[PDB]
């Protein structure tokens, strides 16, 4: 028997699910066939409509106290929840019901972790985080837009393998992935230190791989593992390595708030 997982999408773009399709350890096919039982996930489920609703109810009952609940997307509270309605009911109700019986609860992505892009600017829908909707519950936050999928998968694996969550920081983020500022583990720090800065994309310094601070890099105020774990498991691939500043997508009050080219505060 494999550990059950219930995945509910709220105001999601599907990028957090799509991260799984890039994963290699495990791959999504090994995740769903070997690692977990994905009891509910609307993007992949054969069943639709009444049949998939039955799957949800059956799983909430059969696996009460045992499943991991995962939510992507923000949860909109404005106007009594009507900005995200599934099977005729506000998603906040579906999430609260599922949270009741959950062994562990994970907010995957910046939207569910802290509201993210959907809660930015004037916040049209009164979008909030999963933790805000579940005040009595411990929500594990795995931010990023989307995170490297292994930030999620290794968190789930820790729960399965060792029977408890990984160590978390004071935002309930796993320390193995979010314990350090990007700028405190960035390979361009020597260039920062020496005053070797790109000033415009395509300029001589940019074309030598210099520090992107003056292009707006938010590494100085963003916790994450983008410079080390990076992305897609090919080697060498993260935004800064490709030539673009960190935008702070992991970090509340940075990504989707500050301009790309707005300079970060350095500690």
């Amino acid at each position: 028997q494999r550990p059950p997982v219930i995945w509910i999408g709220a105001q999601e773009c599907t990028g957090c699910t799509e991260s799984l399709l890039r994963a290699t350890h495990p791959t999504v096919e090994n995740l769903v066939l070997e690692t977990i039982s994905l009891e509910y996930h609307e993007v992949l489920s054969a069943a639709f409509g009444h049949q998939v609703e039955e799957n949800k109810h059956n799983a909430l009952e059969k696996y009460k106290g045992q499943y991991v609940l995962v939510v992507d997307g923000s949860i909109p509270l404005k106007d009594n929840g009507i900005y995200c309605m599934v099977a005729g009911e506000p998603i906040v109700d579906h999430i609260r019901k599922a949270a009741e019986g959950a062994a562990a609860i994970i907010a995957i992505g910046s939207c569910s972790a802290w509201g993210g892009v959907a809660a930015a600017g004037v916040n049209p829908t009164g979008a909030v985080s999963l933790q805000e909707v579940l005040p009595g519950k411990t929500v594990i936050n795995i931010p990023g837009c989307p995170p490297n999928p292994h930030n999620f998968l290794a968190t789930v694996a820790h729960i399965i393998t060792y029977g408890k969550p990984p160590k978390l920081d004071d935002k309930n983020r796993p320390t193995f992935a979010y314990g350090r500022l990007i700028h405190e583990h960035c390979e361009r720090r020597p260039h920062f230190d020496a005053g070797r800065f790109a000033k415009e994309f395509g300029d001589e310094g940019h074309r030598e791989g210099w520090c992107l601070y003056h292009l707006g890099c938010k590494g100085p105020e963003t916790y994450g593992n983008c410079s080390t774990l990076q992305f897609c498991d090919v080697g060498g691939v993260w935004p800064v390595a490709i030539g673009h500043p960190c935008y702070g997508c992991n970090e509340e009050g940075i990504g989707f708030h500050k301009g790309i080219h707005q300079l970060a505060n350095v500690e």
Partner: peptide, 19 residues
Amino acid sequence: INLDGLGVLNLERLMYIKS
């Protein structure tokens, strides 16, 4: 070895080995 450490031999790295 530090399952909770960034940049070291953690559970993500061990899972990668296992893959």
